Symmetry: D3
Subunit: 287 residues, 6 copies
């Protein structure tokens, strides 16, 4: 009975993957605070090696970009040091390791979109911590790992989405007359449900390498808010604003847009589509 060990299983993407794995023959182990804690990297190696998993899905991370900037030690411990121990454990167990990374490894060059050939050059501590986390993974598990870079993640549905999409929908449904959205920072959206489907396919094929997974289109939060407004027949105003209006601890690049040049050779794989279409399917689940 093939074993899968999952970190961040109660996270948004993790919950989808954990649920999808229930109708399979895998023995799934969802780590908890008492068995695996990113703040205690020294206890990770012994735990994972004793479990002897065949597959490791490493989704746990410190994703508060601003907290990472104020407390780079936390970004480092949680995203770099803990990942290194997981990578060393994976290598010792001979386990295939999936590492969820981020479009934030890019931004420093200042161009509009980055593909798998672009050399990462981060703009903040979150991105740096994820980048060194990737290095740890590909050095320890060279021919047996998969690194997936996601953009701005959308997922959770009405009951669990407390991120951008859920917030914009909340404001519309509460009868707000004007909603402000940043128009001078660009990125790409990644549907968590879609990514989940891809991951299930990747586990079964034991796909390896580095891949960018995001809907096509380089857009702003303002563009996204406007699209949501159209879908819900919003009557108020969506106001485009500059970043300066909402000061934040971490610098954000002009764009963290990502596209893939390698997704198309994955013949049977579940793939993303156009951002508006993928956003519309997700927004539809709010009824």
């Amino acid at each position: 009975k093939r074993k899968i060990l999952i970190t961040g299983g109660t996270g948004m993407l993790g919950a989808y993957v954990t649920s999808a794995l229930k109708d399979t023959d895998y023995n799934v182990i969802v780590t908890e605070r008492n068995t695996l804690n990113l703040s205690v990297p020294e206890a990770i190696f012994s735990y994972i090696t004793a479990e002897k998993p065949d597959v490791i899905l490493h989704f746990a991370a410190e994703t508060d970009v601003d907290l990472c900037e104020r407390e780079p030690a936390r970004a480092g411990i949680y995203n770099h040091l803990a990942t290194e121990q997981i990578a060393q454990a994976a290598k010792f167990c001979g386990a295939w390791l999936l590492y969820l990374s981020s479009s934030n490894v890019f931004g420093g060059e200042g161009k509009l979109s980055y593909n798998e050939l672009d050399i990462p050059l981060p703009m903040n501590y979150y991105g740096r911590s994820k980048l060194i986390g990737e290095s740890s993974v590909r050095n320890a598990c060279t021919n047996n790992h998969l690194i997936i870079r996601a953009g701005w993640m959308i997922g959770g549905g009405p009951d669990k989405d407390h991120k951008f999409v859920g917030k914009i929908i909340q404001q519309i449904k509460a009868g707000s007359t004007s909603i402000k959205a940043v128009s001078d920072r660009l990125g790409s959206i990644t549907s968590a449900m879609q990514l989940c489907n891809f991951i299930i396919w990747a586990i079964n094929k034991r796909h390896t390498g580095t891949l960018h997974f995001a809907s096509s289109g380089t857009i702003s939060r303002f563009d996204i808010a406007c699209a949501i407004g159209d879908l819900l027949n919003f009557k108020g105003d969506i106001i485009p604003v500059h970043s300066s209006v909402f000061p934040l601890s971490a610098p954000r690049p002009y764009s963290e847009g990502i596209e893939s040049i390698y997704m198309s050779i994955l013949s049977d794989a579940p793939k993303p589509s156009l951002w508006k279409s993928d956003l519309a399917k997700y927004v539809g689940t709010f009824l």
Copy 2:
């Protein structure tokens, strides 16, 4: 006898913007002198000062320029002579006869910084010879006619209609009308559009008020040519594919910035001036003149 009419002297009177202006001026009290090759030629800057000063215009609208960005990169001498040296003579002539001078400039004075949008407080840093030539032309205007000039920076100009538009919009429309199976449009270079007809209306207002200083005149929105092609496609019920491509598939001589988008922080204080609107609405009105 009746009083002498105020005189307007226009360069580039048969260009996209110039044609709208010359036409709108027919319904005014102004006497309009539309320069031609036989009176004013940008390639003969040395004859400009004598010609303009003898005409003694009250207003000078300087729209003529070498606007082929790629030609300017291959032949910077042409860019310099046409956009800088000629403009210097026009500004000196404006100063000498006391004329209010309007200089049409470009969002291409920006780009080297690499940000998404620029307002009138941003300091120009061009990316190519066309932009450099326009920027130094601006300096010539400011230095000579300090308290009596208006510099307007326009972005990607749309205008001309079915008969005259052979720029981006006209070409996309021609491909749609020809039933092209697919149209490619660059997705990784951004800018702002400027409706020539709206700019014309603003210019008529500006001449009447003698507004001075530097302004950015463009529709709201920082978009790509791909975004524009998609919007035109929707307006004309195009059923072929509109394909986003990177700038590498269409090699060009002149470097283009990631963005030359422009916005204004000063247009709102001109309470009764005709203003641009949202890019999609302004584009829709223009595309409507084709069908």
Copy 3:
């Protein structure tokens, strides 16, 4: 003494620097006009030229400005109107009157280059809208009053307290006096301090001589806000903690450079002009007025 009654017109007369200058001018024989909102308002630049030309002053001290750096980044229209457009009208008025114009500028015109300090030969390259607005204001002043203006760039200003110090130094002193026992101060932002009292002394001297050009006026030393906070603490017998933090801990609207330190290469040839000294000494003198 002087057979004619000469006039000084001051903007920002109640500000930190302005209040010292105004008090100092009471001893002189100049007719001093201290503008107020009813006669000159930066938000109404269109009324400035006629007002100043009617006063026909011999000297104009232009200290008024929108100096909230973060507000300027959020509302660049306000920075533009108050610091650029209003200044342009003042400069045109000074030129019309033959008045010597003193313009207070800022170390914030620098920062984009990323080096540790800047002198008068360094070419301004700002990092935010406040800095751009002051720089463009400087251009207005030079292009209008070339052989009859003085631009002084000041760094982080100290002075006027406890009643008028509302800047960085005043805020640290205020927290200590309020009984705070733990004060955070940014260790990754470097700059130079300028004593307002001292700068006032220099200005009185500059008015008399009608000194012209561009000059940096700041105490010697490029230091961090943390270094300054520790120095203030010592001077005030503070026994609590001064905690050094990174700029990420205090998110702000406007980007700030690694350093806006300024030094002067021209102050030393100004023989008997009052000059600044070492930052710690100048800070001590000022704190010595509180105690």
Copy 4:
């Protein structure tokens, strides 16, 4: 009998190396369409591991810089993914792996010349694809690989040279009134025949690490055209032009010039010389 497996064996350099290995005791396998294709990296590992070579010479690559920029997927599949599978196979077999890379891994910094201590920072997709290829070779074959970075390759002679030097000579022998050459893009030349001689030596020594192999000098195509013109007593005009007069899909750096700080250590290795001397020797093969 030691087995050598060569990719790109029918390319210009590959053909020289294949030919030079004929009078050796090696069993040489030159891959073909029926056994290995850069377009199908998914079939490489099984094939190479089944052959169990002792040495792998990886010369095949997508070298059309402009095509790489328009189609980064092709640059990535051919130069990155294929190279990764070749490196994994070499590691599995315990084979010494030679990877031919490029000066184009540099250029982003904008300086005039780069040595082996300079950190690669590419300017275009071709350069990025070669660099990521080098990383695959280093993450898989530590202590058993040789990465050679070549500059502007010259080779082929009057029958096979259709690159810059061949075209200049063609225009000169056709009696053209003028020749235009870009003067504001700099680089270094690498003699293919010299590089081949060095490679034979490296195979025999199983030399390892990263090395820059190019004639000494950072020069423009204009400099090169002018040099060829003197050698052939050309009487037309050689006109220097800016790169802007020839628009291309891929950006090029102000310089991709490379020099070596480690070549002189290899006492007995065949080495390049000065660019003008190396170019004169190559141009001489077109006379007769």
Copy 5:
């Protein structure tokens, strides 16, 4: 007895370490020009493997930053090629390897300070040679190495200190009327004696990873000269000058200051303190 092999044992740091190891149970082998020469990297692997050390302390390097810029071949051979051979030998023997690196791997970005998450981007050939040296250590000794980045090293005392601090003290004692010190290049100081104490602790814990070890504070040579002046009651003038006054072959960044986000988690390890307390203790050893 476990065997410790040391390169650069007669250097500033090497001498403090060599002496501190005499009061321990290790068999210490101090390499010298007859057994290991950085200029002869070809002889290193055979010698180290024959010795079979359990621990390797690699402190030897070409540290003349300006010489490195003029002769990058020397920088490469001594700091990269030799380090590559030492790393391969360490892997072959299963030896824990400690590599002394430098703050000079940073500087190209132009910011005021760098922590362990910052991606190295050197400004000169010395820095590049040290960085490529670090890469060799990581690629070869995956999970069994410690890389310590030090700043401006202070140590040696009255008889051996001929570096920055020593020179300032000499000018003070000679009664110079004025001392010039560069005010526009910043960095961080590292007390050699303290670093020695940390190294002894690291050897015994076999601590691994990459760590920055320097006193707290980003300062200039001028700040340091002023602090020494105060400590020695110097009556002359300490003049802040721009770096142009002292032309040097190697470019120096605006700052090479380093700080650590990981030192704090090492509970019982000997730590550095504030730059003035640490400088004062060292200056105290001159009188």
Copy 6:
């Protein structure tokens, strides 16, 4: 009454040639001296020049020691900026046509290989900045009655007065030196002082105005110049290319300060420069 030409830096290398060329004219030439004008005392310039009432001002005096300017920016400022500003204000008052000799050093910060008159100055050091701000002073005060000429690496003096790069290379060759070292990784353009003198005389008579780059065609290194001189003088020793790092200096130097002109061709009858090798050979011929 004769038209008056007032010259600063008249005893300098370029200034001395212009002064001699003007002896064969109807101009009343006034060469400034310590008793009338000093760059160190800008405060005394305006009263002097306005009392003198020149019709033409040739402003050649400057602090050109680039490294000294970096160590002592106050000197660079006073001499090149403040003095120039006072001269510009005096020219404006007198209605005099003002010639200001500037430098390619106003460029370099961008890091490209060559700069024309449309490129926006962005200097690399204090010397460059001081010259640039001096230029602004000249434009802002004499808009329609000034000429700013930017020269590159100046060559001139001959066997008696040349103690700069060319002169030093020639002394080493005639002395039979074993080797000569020259920097290969810093580029620029050469300007013939004699050709510039001829151009200046033409410009004075035409009262030509604006900004113009005056230099021989070609972006080259000191090493290229040294090698060309060696060929001309049949030198048989070694000419070794070295990196700029072997000669540390106070002022940063750009990868290139090369300048070219896009406006020199429209000045039909003006004396112009030619190719760098031709212009160099002619200069080198004055030493034989």
